[PDB]
């Protein structure tokens, strides 16, 4: 038969690469390809996709770099949409979008590496500084999703716990108060998940209140070791890196094999209906939308650069492979590789914070406690002081002294 697939990218080069890549596994039901350019002024954008792809008999749409309307429109009609570039954590909403099946896992996922590090370096106390638009709300949610685990029915061991969760505001000018109320707690483990400015005005704020000396620890996210995250970065930082990278033409080929491994499952002749051409009122829609999607998100091995490309229980890329990154005061340098269940550090120098080559404990138990009491005559007497500032001495009946504070 005839089957069409379209895409809205920014490089004419990959446009030919996509047709070539589907033509490759085509030999291994004619499966054709379509594409359309990209433009600014996103208002006009949805006045392109419908007339350029729904005019065809599409069964997916591919998008790359911007969160444009191509998420909503083709989501109406419930035609599965495949994502390449962006991975803000907002697209996981089953209810908001029934469109995205994505390739680059979302920021909020990167908080599974962290819960691993806290078992390969044995830190059981943290301080968390989430952001306050949406991503943090998500990142914190997924992190708390793990730390609630390990509920002890291993075999009577100690487990991590949260300590304080400060929530600053996405647009901030003076933020030291949160830092001031942070050092008062015990630990020295900081997890800063925020955006570029949202880390510049924290890096430039924790070294001037001396929150980056020895015994300190920082785990960050890829947007926080990025670009303007080097003008003030804390030497001795720890950041992450995924081995897929932000390469457009990296896995378009990988995506092709996902629908390829699916058209032969769709040729089950149970009930198939074409996607209707034209954009003028085929009001209700069923392209086996739920069914065709249920096909796609069930173990389609992407013919691509990464092995065993699966689809998580929600629709985002599963089983990625990260590579633990680290800075020594100027040069962000690999120190490891993270692979699903494989936590694998490399062999090089981890100049920990402060330039002290120890593996500092995430703990500093305080001394100067604070106590509270109430006047009670047999137990706690209350008497004014002497004028000088001390208060009067005294001996008991046997003449021994009496201890006042």
């Amino acid at each position: 038969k005839i089957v069409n697939i379209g895409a809205v990218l920014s490089t004419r080069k990959h446009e030919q690469m996509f047709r070539e890549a589907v033509n490759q596994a085509n030999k291994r039901i004619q499966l054709q390809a379509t594409s359309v350019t990209h433009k600014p002024n996103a208002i006009q954008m949805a006045l392109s996709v419908c007339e350029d792809l729904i005019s065809s008999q599409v069964y997916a749409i591919l998008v790359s770099h911007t969160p444009t309307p191509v998420s909503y429109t083709a989501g109406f009609y419930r035609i599965p949409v495949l994502g390449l570039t962006t991975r803000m954590s907002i697209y996981s909403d089953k209810s908001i979008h029934l469109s995205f099946l994505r390739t680059v896992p979302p920021y909020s996922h990167q908080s599974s590496v962290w819960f691993e590090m806290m078992r390969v370096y044995n830190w059981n106390h943290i301080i968390l500084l989430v952001s306050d638009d949406h991503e943090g709300r998500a990142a914190q949610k997924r992190l708390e999703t793990l730390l609630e685990e390990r509920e002890s029915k291993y075999d009577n061991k100690r487990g991590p716990k949260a300590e304080k969760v400060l929530q600053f505001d996405p647009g901030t000018k003076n933020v030291t108060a949160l830092l001031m109320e942070a050092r008062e707690l015990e630990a020295r483990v900081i997890i800063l998940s925020a955006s570029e400015d949202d880390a510049a005005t924290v890096y430039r704020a924790a070294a001037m209140l001396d929150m980056t000396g020895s015994g300190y620890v920082w785990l960050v996210g890829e947007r926080e070791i990025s670009g303007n995250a080097l003008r003030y970065a804390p030497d001795g930082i720890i950041g992450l890196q995924l081995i897929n990278g932000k390469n457009e033409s990296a896995h378009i080929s990988d995506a092709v094999g996902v629908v390829a491994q699916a058209v032969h499952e769709l040729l089950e002749k149970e009930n198939i209906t074409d996607p209707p051409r034209g954009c003028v009122g085929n009001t209700n829609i069923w392209k086996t939308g739920p069914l065709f999607k249920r096909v796609l998100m069930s173990s389609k091995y992407a013919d691509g650069v990464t092995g065993r490309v699966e689809f998580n229980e929600d629709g985002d890329r599963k089983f990625a492979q990260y590579s633990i990154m680290n800075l020594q005061n100027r040069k962000l340098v690999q120190v490891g590789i993270y692979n699903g269940t494989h936590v694998i550090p490399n062999d090089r120098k981890i100049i920990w914070p402060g330039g002290e080559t120890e593996k500092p404990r995430g703990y500093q138990m305080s001394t100067r406690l604070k106590i509270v009491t109430i006047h009670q005559e047999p137990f706690v007497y209350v008497k004014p002081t002497m004028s000088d500032g001390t208060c009067k001495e005294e001996f008991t009946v046997n003449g021994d002294p009496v201890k006042k504070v």
Binding site: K370, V372, I374
Partner: protein, 51 residues
């Protein structure tokens, strides 16, 4: 210290030194404080030092 409704509402807050502990304002209550069930669900009581 004890629980009490506030705001003409059902929000339950404490008073006095117990509230000063739970609010982190204090750290330890070294004072003649009794031992009961209703405080035991927010606080850690040492062994008793006077029956």
């Amino acid at each position: 210290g004890t629980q009490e409704r506030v705001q003409n509402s059902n929000k339950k807050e404490w008073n006095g030194m117990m509230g000063e502990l739970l609010s982190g304002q204090a750290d330890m209550i070294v004072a003649p404080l009794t031992i009961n069930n209703e405080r035991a669900q927010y606080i850690e009581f040492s062994k008793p030092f006077k029956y």
